[PDB]
Every structure is written in structure tokens, then in C-alpha cells.
Amino acid sequence: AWKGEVLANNEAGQVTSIIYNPGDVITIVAAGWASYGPTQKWGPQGDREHPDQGLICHDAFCGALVMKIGNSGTIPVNTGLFRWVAPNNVQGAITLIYNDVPGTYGNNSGSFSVNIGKDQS
Amino acid sequence: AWKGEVLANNEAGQVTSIIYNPGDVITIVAAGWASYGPTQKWGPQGDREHPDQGLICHDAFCGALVMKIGNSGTIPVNTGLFRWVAPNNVQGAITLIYNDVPGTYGNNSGSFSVNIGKDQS
Amino acid sequence: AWKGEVLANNEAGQVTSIIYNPGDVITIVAAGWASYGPTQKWGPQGDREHPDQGLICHDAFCGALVMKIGNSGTIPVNTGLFRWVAPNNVQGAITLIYNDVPGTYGNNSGSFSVNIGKDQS
Amino acid sequence: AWKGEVLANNEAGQVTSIIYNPGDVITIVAAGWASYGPTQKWGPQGDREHPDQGLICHDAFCGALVMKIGNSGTIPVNTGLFRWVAPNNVQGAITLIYNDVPGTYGNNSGSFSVNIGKDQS
Ligand SMILES: OC[C@H]1O[C@@H](O)[C@H](O)[C@@H](O)[C@H]1O
Ligand SMILES: OC[C@H]1O[C@H](O)[C@H](O)[C@@H](O)[C@H]1O
Ligand SMILES: OC[C@H]1O[C@H](O)[C@H](O)[C@@H](O)[C@H]1O
Ligand SMILES: OC[C@H]1O[C@H](O)[C@H](O)[C@@H](O)[C@H]1O
Ligand SMILES: [Ca+2]
Ligand SMILES: [Ca+2]
Ligand SMILES: [Ca+2]
Ligand SMILES: [Ca+2]
């Protein structure tokens, strides 16, 4: 299991120690407050009022938490995933990423605290 | 495990099938958009800008998800809890509740989708 | 979780810190070598060749590991239990006992090492 | 989880469905009665009084339950493993095997019943 923080200004993403293997069941819980630029902050579901201006994940709001598994496409995480299984061909290290437009992470602030574990089978 | 939806207008909150006993380790993941009155909506951490005007839980923002376990006081859930152990002597059925001021739930809207499971211990 | 030793000459049994609650799923693994009297020793399944001369558990061999949950009757453990659930109305502290005839524990020797955990639900 | 029986007379051993990946935590519980030749039978810890005359696993008794994980050497299982983690660089499918001297399985009898599960990690 992994516990850390995903900084909103970290464009490359936070690599975790979790390697998602075929058949794994995982749970993720995310919490905290961050911004993609404004004074206002949002939690891991991001800002439902802000338009998509070229986000790394089009299936979540700006300011949301998303992930890749290996070099997969971005997968929405938001507040977390409960006993979740990836698509069959998806595997590799889990990288956690704040959802913003490429090149615009430098003005971000805050972070999410994220915990990941593998469930029993 | 238990999966269900907690309505923001339900002042009594929603009882779940989960009985918490001493020693138990639990994980909760909560998702969704709800409001305590305004046309805006907030996730399970609620509205960090809004003052406490007599909330059922003073340790969480207005519009946050909270819970009671048996005869306990309110405990913040927010986005969830990862492999969490309850305070000393806490025991009984988990009830989930939207954090608002008593008597003011009538103008609330939306819901949270919540999963609760017991972990290994 | 709990780990410890169960002495073959302990007629009262070894109380554990595990309280079995309704709906709990438990796993037990036991190891070691013990005797009810003879110079030979046996594992946690006991001695399949020896007759029952008034054992505390008639559903296990002499020299087997058994348990009580609360003030239940004796339940065979043997080498252990995998993701096991108790019958209705069985609850309380787990006590681990060597299966021998009452009043005859004085000539017993050896012990079993036992691990107990609660599983995910 | 996987469940099955490991025949004492099966020199190839029993290939399970469990794939051990780095970081995985496993639990095994084994039960039953088997022999390496004599008319008497022993549990999964084997015969503590028999010498090692060239066993496939020199770290367990003759008649004990052992395993290999992918390409690895033999590892003792005995009555089971509780929340066990393998070394660095040990991975793959788990094969269960009765511990006897190669070429001498033909006179063996009985079997062990084995449950294997992956724990939370
Ligand atoms: O059947 C149980 C009895 O077995 C005898 O062999 C032993 O010496 C007694 O102490 C008692 O344990
Ligand atoms: O739409 C995303 C965009 O939003 C605002 O304009 C921010 O100031 C930028 O940094 C970028 O995050
Ligand atoms: O502070 C809580 C309070 O917030 C606003 O006033 C809402 O309109 C009320 O219904 C109540 O929820
Ligand atoms: O030591 C192992 C050896 O034990 C006895 O000799 C059995 O008869 C053999 O088949 C072999 O299993
Ligand atoms: Ca930005
Ligand atoms: Ca309200
Ligand atoms: Ca005795
Ligand atoms: Ca043999």
C-alpha cells in the first residue's frame, strides 16, 4: 500500500510504489484542497464550473485527480475508486496526476493526500 | 460491504448494513455533488468558505459527509477513510449524514454515492 | 489479529485478544508439535489412531487444536480455518485449547503456534 | 482464492491459479493426511522423525507440504503461511508439492487439502 501527496503543480505526476498487475483489485481514497490557478480551491473532483481548455483527462473536471497505469491514457480517480479492476490490457506503475492543461501547471497550488491499497482475493 | 446513496435533504441520514466493532478497520469512499441551499454544488468535503452556523459536525465543513457509529457523536468522513480505526469504545451501526444545521435540510439537493467495506485486521 | 502459543498442558486454554463478532470472517493457521502423554508428538490435527476416551471435543482427534468462541461448545481448528464464519449465536472471545480428556493434561507437552486474523468483507 | 488437493503420489505437484507478484501477501492453510510409503499417515508438517534422504526440500520434513513460485527453489509451507511475503525477485505461478525423494513418489498415498488466498497489501 502506498500513501503520499500529489502536488497540483507537478505536471509529470507522482509515481507511486503500486504496480497494477492483471487481476488486481485496488482501492484509492483521495482528500485535500488544490487550485489550478484561482484563489479558490477545490477537492479531488475538481471544478465542475470550469470549461475543458485541453485537459490531460477529458473525462474529469479541471482540478480533479486522475491516474495512469503504465503509459495508459488518463483514468479518472476523483475522490477514489473502491475495489476497482482495470481493463484487461492495463498494467504497470500507478502515476497520480492533477488534471490541468499541459504547460499550465506552474501556477497551481495545494495538493491531494492519496492512499492506495490492494484488496484481498 | 455496503453501497448506497446519502441524500443531502435527509436530516436523519442513511443507516448502512455495516456494524463497526472494536478492532475493526474500515474503508469508505464517497463521491458526488450536493448542496446545502445555494445553486452551486460541492463534493463530500463541503464548502470551505461557509461559516459554521450550528452544524451537526463542527469538525467538518457545511455540506461535508459525516457519520455516527451507534451512540457516537458525529465523525467527519469527507471523501472517505482509508483503513481507519474508530475512536475508543465506538461500536455499532454506521449511519451516514449530510452536514448541515438542524432544521435547515429542506432546501438541500443532491446526494453522495458511498461504498463502505471492512478491511483485514 | 493475534499470534501466540497454546500449551498442550494448559487445561483452561489460551484466551486470545480476538473477539468473534456476528458476520466476522476469520482465518487461523496453527503449527507445531505436541503430545497428550506418549513420547511421540503430533501436529495440530492430533493423533488419528487414538480412541476418544472423553475428549473435550468429540469432533477432533486427541491432541488436535480446538477452540471455543465465547461460551460455545468446542469447535475443531486443527491446522486452521480459511475465511471461516461461525454459526448463528456464536460470538465472543476466542479461547484456544489442546484436545485432551479432562483431568489428564498434566502429562502433556509441547505447544502450537497460532495466528488469527479477520478477513475483508 | 484457489482450493484443491495435492496428491502425495504426484511428483510434478499441483499447479495453482495463484500468480505471486512482487509485494503480494499470501495466506495458505493446509490440512489432511498423507504418507511417503508407510501405512501410517502424517499431516502437512510431515514426519519429524524421518531422515532426509534427498528430499526436494531440505528445509521441511519428509511428507511435508512445500511449494515453488515460478522458477524458484522449494519453499516450506507445512500447515500454512499467514500473511507471508516472498523475497525480492521471487514471482510466478505457485505449484504445491508433497515433499519426498525424487523417484520415490509411486508408493505414496493420501493427500492434503489446501486453500490459498491473496491478502490485502
Ligand atoms: O485419551 C487421552 C489419554 O491418553 C493417554 O495416553 C494419556 O496418557 C492420558 O494422559 C490422556 O491424555
Ligand atoms: O483551463 C486551465 C487553465 O485555467 C486557468 O486559466 C489557469 O490560470 C491556467 O493556469 C490553466 O490551469
Ligand atoms: O449554514 C447553513 C445554512 O446555509 C444556508 O443558509 C442555507 O440556505 C440554509 O438552509 C442552511 O443550510
Ligand atoms: O526417505 C524417503 C523414502 O522413505 C521410504 O523409504 C519410502 O518407502 C520411500 O518411498 C521414500 O519416500
Ligand atoms: Ca494552472
Ligand atoms: Ca440547508
Ligand atoms: Ca494427557
Ligand atoms: Ca515414497
Domain boundaries, chain D: 1-121
CB A116 within 8 A of CB A18: yes
Contacts of A65-68 with C-beta under 8 Å, sequence gap 24+, read: A65/A6, A65/A30, A65/A96, A65/A97, A65/A98, A65/A99, A65/A112, A65/A114, A66/A96, A66/A97, A66/A98, A66/A99, A67/A28, A67/A94, A67/A95, A67/A96, A67/A97, A68/A13, A68/A94, A68/A95, A68/A97
Task: Taking the CA atoms of B8, B13, B19 and B21 in sequence, report the sign of the dihedral they define.
Answer: positive
Closest CA to A62 of A114, A6, A108: A108
Q: For residue A38, count other CB atoms closer than 10 A to its CB.
A: 12
Closest CA to C46 of C4, C116, C6, C99: C99
Side-chain half-sphere of B98: how many Cα atoms within 13 Å?
Answer: 34
Task: Answer whether B80 sits within 8 Å of A29, measured CB to CB.
Answer: yes
Distance CA A121, CA B103 (A): 45
Closest CA to D35 of C48, C110, C33: C48
Task: Answer whether D22 sits within 8 Å of A23, measured CB to CB.
Answer: no
Distance CA C91, CA D98 (A): 37
Measured at the CA of C78, the angle between CA C75 and CA C80, to 5 degrees, comes to: 95
Distance CA D80, CA D73 (A): 17
Distance CA B84, CA B92 (A): 15
Give the experimental resolution in Å. 1.6
Q: What is the DSSP letter of C120?
A: P
Q: For residue C59, count other CB atoms closer than 10 A to its CB.
A: 13
CB A84 within 8 A of CB A16: no
CB A99 within 8 A of CB A55: yes
Nearest CA distance, C84 vs chain D (angstrom): 12
> Which residue has a Cα nearest atom 10 of ligand 4?
D104
Q: How close is the Cα of C77 to the center of ligand 8, in Å?
A: 29
What residues have a C-beta under 5 A from ligand 5, the ion?
Answer: A 36-37, 100, 104, 107-108
Phi and psi dihedrals of A105, rounded to 5? Answer: -80, -15
Which 3 state secondary structure label does DSSP give B86?
coil
Nearest CA distance, B59 vs chain C (angstrom): 29
Distance CA B81, CA B119 (A): 11
Q: Across the strands, what pairs with C81?
A: C28
Nearest CA distance, D111 vs chain C (angstrom): 14
For residue B114 the three cell numbers come to 458511498
What Cα–Cα distance (Å) separates residue D59 from each residue in A43, B106, D37?
Answer: 53, 69, 20
For C13, residues 6+ apart whose C-beta sits below 8 A from its C-beta are C6, C67, C68, C95, C96, C97, C98
Distance CA B69, CA B94 (A): 5
CB D17 within 8 A of CB D3: no
Task: Answer whether A29 sits within 8 Å of B31, measured CB to CB.
Answer: no
Atom of ligand 1 nearest to the CA of C106: 10
CB D69 within 8 A of CB D93: yes
Distance CA C53, CA C30 (A): 24
Distance CA D74, CA D71 (A): 10
Q: What is the DSSP letter of C11?
A: T
Which 3 state secondary structure label does DSSP give C105?
helix
| Chain C residues lying within 8 Å of B117, measured CB to CB | 120-121
- DSSP, residue by residue, chain D: -EEEEEETT-TT-EEEEEEE-TT-EEEEEEEEEEESSSSS-B-TB--TTS--SS-S-TTS-TTBEEEEETT---EE-TTEEEEE---TT--EEEEEEE---TT-GGG-EEEEEEEEEEEP-
Distance CA C67, CA C88 (A): 16
- Locate all alpha helices (DSSP H) within chain B, ordered by sequence: none
CB D69 within 8 A of CB D90: yes
Query: For chain B, how are helix, strand and coil distributed in percent, rounded to 5?
Result: 0, 45, 50
Distance CA B40, CA D119 (A): 42
Q: How close is the Cα of C46 to the center of ligand 7, in Å?
A: 12
Query: In testing the pocket of ligand 2, which one of A42, A52, A53 has its CB within 8 Å of the most ligand atoms?
Result: A53
Q: What is the DSSP letter of B107?
A: G
| Chain C residues lying within 8 Å of A118, measured CB to CB | none
Q: How close is the Cα of B101 to the center of ligand 3, in Å?
A: 7
Distance CA A110, CA A41 (A): 8
Which 3 state secondary structure label does DSSP give B54?
coil
Q: How close is the Cα of B110 to the center of ligand 5, in Å?
A: 29
Nearest chain D alpha carbon to B118: D120
Distance CA B78, CA B31 (A): 9
Closest CA to D110 of C33, C76, C48, C64: C48
> Which residue has a Cα nearest atom 6 of ligand 1?
C37
- DSSP, residue by residue, A10-73: -TT-EEEEEEE-TT--EEEEEEEEEESSSSS-B-TB--TTS--SS-S-TTS-TTBEEEEETTPP
Cβ < 6 A, ligand 3 pocket: B 36-37, 53, 62, 100-101, 104, 107
Distance CA D34, CA D108 (A): 8
CATH of D1-121, picked from 3.40.50.1980, 2.40.30.10, 2.60.120.430, 3.40.50.620, is 2.60.120.430
Distance CA D28, CA A78 (A): 36
Q: For chain D, list residues whose CB is within 8 angstroms of any CB belonging to chain B.
A: 119-120
CB B50 within 8 A of CB B100: no
Distance CA B109, CA B54 (A): 19
Indicate whether residue C47 lines ligand 1 (CB < 6 A): no
Distance CA D79, CA C53 (A): 27
- Whose cell is 495512469? That residue is A68
